[PDB]
RNA sequence: AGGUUUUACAGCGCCCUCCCGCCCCGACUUCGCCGCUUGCUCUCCGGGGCCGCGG
RNA sequence: GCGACAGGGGUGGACUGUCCUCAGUCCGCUGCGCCGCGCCGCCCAGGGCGGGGGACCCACGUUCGGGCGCCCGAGGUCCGCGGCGACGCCGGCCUCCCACCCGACCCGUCUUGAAACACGGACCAAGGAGUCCAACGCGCGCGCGAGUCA
RNA sequence: CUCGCCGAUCAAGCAGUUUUAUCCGGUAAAGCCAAUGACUAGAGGCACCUAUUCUCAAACUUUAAAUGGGUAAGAGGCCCGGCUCGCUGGCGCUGGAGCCGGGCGUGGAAUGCGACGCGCCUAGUGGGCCAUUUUUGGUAAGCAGAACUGGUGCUGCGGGAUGAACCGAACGCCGGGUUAAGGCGCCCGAUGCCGACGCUCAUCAGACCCCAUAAAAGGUGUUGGUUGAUAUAGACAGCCCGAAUCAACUAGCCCUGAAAAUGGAUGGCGCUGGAGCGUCGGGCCCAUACCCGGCCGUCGACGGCAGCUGCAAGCCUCGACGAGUAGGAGGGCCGCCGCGGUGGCGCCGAAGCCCAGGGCGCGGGCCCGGGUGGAGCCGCCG
RNA sequence: GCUUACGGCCAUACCACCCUGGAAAUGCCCGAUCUCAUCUGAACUCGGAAGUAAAGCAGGGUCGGGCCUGGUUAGUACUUGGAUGGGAGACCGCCUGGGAAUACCAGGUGCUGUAAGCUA
């Protein structure tokens, strides 16, 4: 026999979108052809995110997309995001965005188009930019869910700052012995 | 091969000795099995890339 | 009905199963526990430069 | 030590490692009988290590070669001074043998000590081997072969080749 | 079961050497410990204030905080199967500067001068430590040191 | 201890030698007294078993 | 060539000893390293290396490239062949019966340990044990998105 | 999931391992003529006192290992300039720390490896047992309790006759070759070698890890060895004779010591120029182990594809790998009943049942044929 | 080289006895008005300068004790790892590495930083 541990032979990486969506699996059939033959590091990152789940594809608000486009060097590039571009109602101006995403909400689609912008899809992106040139791949706040506020050391340890699971946030709910 | 013979002959000619240079290459062969190995010895056999019985590697000395 | 009291037999094999990882030394170590007189001045050396 | 086959005589010389305090240290010569040179080097670092203060890591072996017999075609009377460790204590012992080569005479000592005294190879320590003349032999088992015009038959020749004919009609003769 | 006292088993480690008792020599008090230097830990039974725990006597950590009489050290202590960085407060009478990194700093300063010397001269001196190589081939002369015959000695009781 | 005392009616050692006085056999796998090996050992160089799946 | 030392003379002096203006101690060749030269030594052209004054070997001969073949060459083919072919003289090897060689203790369960002189089981058929509701957590699919669910 | 995938094009970092460098300790040993405590004997100086002496410590130690523990081996570095502060203060640098800019790869020990990187959810378990070494209580225990590591529990295989743990070695299905431990009189594969040397006779011989018992004490059984004493100025033995002899001790094999109950156990037969003991040589025998090749599957790829295929949820290429209870997960063109779709079958014979019939799948199972039966049944996507 | 002040390492510096030394300095020494001080001007504090080496101090001496260093003890004791090694057992031998301690023997005995002054 051979002295080797088979504990971590399997690499747990999603190699196929767990969704049975038809249009999403067609984009996978498109970017798998580019991840093999285009020889561009952009298509290899879009292919991963087409597999990822909804929690690994968080929304991207307009304000969080506008600020990343106003950085120096993003003059006439595209804002690629594998997910939904939600609207940020507490922002006012839209500076002529050129985005490309799977879904765009009805208000975000209106504010981008009314400002003269352009909204694309991942099939049009692979048509005009097969190498992925002139793109700015963005993402949303993956650690922005309420679920991550409960993850930590423990609610009852020093320097925890972890949100405990309670039925209702009140006075008689876990504030007596250990919180003072 | 002929140089080490030359150095050994000129040392015996004068009654002296010529100690050859210690070897710089070694061929290690694992002979024992893989069950019942000490953790300090098992770690070395993994660094020598000798994980199964009857396999050989070259080791710089 | 006595039992076995204490043992550390299989513990060393369980420790090195997932390895004994040293603490991750990160750049820019924390500043908790430092002298409060020293930290109060250091925060005054950052809001004036 | 295993004492496999014929024990060949090796002349192993060695010395301490030269330093700045003791440059060119003294050289020590040894008379080692071992089956191969790998064991002969280890036997050198066993006796020299207990006679002088020098280990294998503190010194080096300068020469280790075979010592052939000068007269392999002449019967000689050898005398071997040894000391073996029995189950009780260590005992000095002087045994006389008779062979053509000193490599085979010491080999007979390891076979004799193991047969008569049950001594293994690691307990025996050969100290002196000397070609003794036929006048200074103390053992009567060798002195009987010191008779010129020696004469003796080979009585009761036991049948070997007992399996070449395994079945036959003739019983073997033992008088020749 | 043993007692969980803080000084159980410290009969010999916190003791002082033979004929080395008395007051602490005043050189250990005038040593400057900056923030980020490697210091050793060696408790002393003379100063019962701020003495380290027996699980740190002989360990080594780096300084992260300096106070009037003591020094905050970051020591890595393995508890069961995990190594944890412990922030302890030990007075300067139980610690001393670790010379484990002084051999590295002296080696760097010698490397920074060997490359600037080879650059302005045009050589290829290698700046890298190497293990003890096998001994080269050398001649052993027997002009005045003839090989002396050794042999085992007889057994005497 | 051969010949009647040391070579004699056999031989066995050890020294100075006459250049190693001089030639011939090289661990004998090259004529079966004893070791280590290629410095890539050479052979349509022999014989036996096993199976050639795929495309 | 020069450095580490070995042995004595002349001058001054400090000290020591119950031999006392007598004794003694002390202060002011050989070894290694380093080079340079000469000579000699390494199947002998030194068979350690590089250059100069009869046959075997040269991926040297004037720069490559192009057609036809062979094959110790990207894992086998025969452009070799024989006897039988009428339900019988051929074929099935798994299943049926039987024989022999090797192996082979009875399952379930509790247990550190069960073939156990530990328990349950004579045999066969049918039935026979992780469910549904409320609520919670995490992962995933979907819809919309600072909204969402009527 | 975040990356590295492209190897030191790159920064790397990591390690049940060494090397270099620097610290930690008070165990083994040693010591007590050194301290504390215990302890024997004389001697000198007028019970003490001094210098010696014998013997010890786990809760004593001057000294002090081996093994071992921590840390350091670079860009998060090194060096230089400027600035900030309410802290510090003879000394706008007096310290200190922060901030900003610039200069400088010969990544500045060996070996190995994709990072056992960052999280989330989480079952089972919480009676363990055994061995080498260390070690406590006990006369001892197949006893009780600890330490390091391995094994086992969860594990089959070759060897030890037999076997939980011993030795060798860990396991997909096979052909060939070769070994480990152990063996080669016959059972029983292999010495059916003209194997080498010596020891040994047993009226209870002996026959090899764990291991299945044997001691003190003895022998003029026999074979070696050590140290001495006598002897042609003639010993020893014998009632003069003329060449060796005697004593002590030691170590091998054998023997005495050695007595239990159903008949019996080197495994059995049996073996004595051996089939015994000791030291060794050559050859040979086979494990699911090693090597070469075929096949299945899993895993990985810094992978290959928009005459034949392309059911891309498909096909093709390469390399490594395969034990497993408790438990977890995936796959199922495995099986049963019912529903919405869909594609059928049936009195020219449905379901069920039976079979020494023909076959498929690793398997769960399935298809076909024959017989029986007499009215319903099934495939695929959900 | 020496004498002082403050030290660093803390016996190579300590301990017993003997000998020698005062240029500066140091010490002893001479007084109790003030400051202070105790049973007591011994000490402590204060004022002072007749004497100059008895002691402190410094430098030497001792087949000195101690301490320090080296040799040796010894590759001994012990120990890492290994074996289907020996042995009834206790225990022992060997292979692979590391490797002490007393006794005994020999040598040595303070080094040095900052500041001030003197050439006995
Ligand atoms: Mg084993
Ligand atoms: Mg328990
Ligand atoms: Mg208990
Ligand atoms: Mg366990
Ligand atoms: Mg042996
Ligand atoms: Mg207690
Ligand atoms: Mg010189
Ligand atoms: Mg049960
Ligand atoms: Mg129960
Ligand atoms: Mg029973
Ligand atoms: Mg029953
Ligand atoms: Mg049923
Ligand atoms: Mg939960
Ligand atoms: Mg870095
Ligand atoms: Mg419990
Ligand atoms: Mg639990
Ligand atoms: Mg048992
Ligand atoms: Mg127990
Ligand atoms: Mg029990
Ligand atoms: Mg297991
Ligand atoms: Mg048995
Ligand atoms: Mg086979
Ligand atoms: Mg057998
Ligand atoms: Mg008797
Ligand atoms: Mg007798
Ligand atoms: Mg007599
Ligand atoms: Mg007996
Ligand atoms: Mg293979
Ligand atoms: Mg499996
Ligand atoms: Mg139902
Ligand atoms: Mg005087
Ligand atoms: Mg003295
Ligand atoms: Mg000493």
Coordinates of N, CA, C and O (backbone and C1' of nucleotides) and ligand atoms in Angstrom, one line a residue, chain H residues 160-163 209-212 266-267, ligand 21:
Chain H
rG160 P 3.3 -21.3 10.1 O5' 3.4 -20.6 11.5 C5' 4.6 -20.5 12.1 C4' 4.5 -20.0 13.5 C3' 3.5 -20.6 14.4 O3' 3.9 -21.9 14.9 C1' 3.3 -18.3 14.6
rA161 P 2.8 -22.9 15.5 O5' 1.6 -22.8 14.5 C5' 1.6 -23.4 13.2 C4' 0.5 -24.4 13.0 C3' -0.9 -24.0 13.4 O3' -1.5 -23.2 12.4 C1' -0.5 -26.1 14.3
rU162 P -2.2 -21.8 12.7 O5' -3.2 -22.1 13.8 C5' -4.5 -22.7 13.5 C4' -5.2 -23.0 14.8 C3' -5.5 -21.8 15.7 O3' -6.7 -21.2 15.3 C1' -4.6 -23.5 17.0
rG163 P -6.7 -19.8 14.4 O5' -7.0 -18.7 15.4 C5' -8.1 -18.8 16.4 C4' -7.8 -18.2 17.7 C3' -7.6 -16.7 17.6 O3' -8.1 -16.1 18.9 C1' -5.6 -17.6 18.3
rC209 P 9.7 -19.1 19.3 O5' 9.8 -17.5 19.7 C5' 11.0 -17.0 20.1 C4' 10.9 -15.5 20.4 C3' 9.7 -15.1 21.3 O3' 10.1 -15.3 22.7 C1' 9.8 -13.7 19.4
rC210 P 9.0 -16.0 23.7 O5' 7.7 -15.0 23.7 C5' 7.8 -13.7 24.2 C4' 6.6 -12.9 23.9 C3' 5.3 -13.5 24.4 O3' 5.0 -13.2 25.8 C1' 5.0 -12.8 22.2
rC211 P 4.2 -14.3 26.7 O5' 4.8 -15.7 26.4 C5' 4.7 -16.8 27.2 C4' 4.9 -18.1 26.5 C3' 6.1 -18.2 25.7 O3' 6.6 -19.6 25.8 C1' 4.2 -18.6 24.3
rA212 P 7.4 -20.1 27.1 O5' 6.3 -20.8 28.0 C5' 5.6 -21.9 27.5 C4' 4.2 -22.0 28.0 C3' 3.5 -23.3 27.8 O3' 3.8 -24.3 28.8 C1' 2.1 -21.5 27.2
rU266 P 4.4 -31.9 23.6 O5' 5.3 -31.7 22.3 C5' 5.0 -30.8 21.3 C4' 6.2 -29.9 21.0 C3' 6.1 -29.0 19.8 O3' 5.4 -27.8 20.1 C1' 8.1 -30.2 19.6
rG267 P 4.6 -27.0 18.9 O5' 3.6 -28.1 18.3 C5' 2.4 -28.3 19.0 C4' 1.4 -29.1 18.1 C3' 1.9 -30.5 17.7 O3' 1.7 -31.5 18.7 C1' 0.9 -29.4 15.9
Ligands
LIG21 MG1 2.4 -22.0 19.0

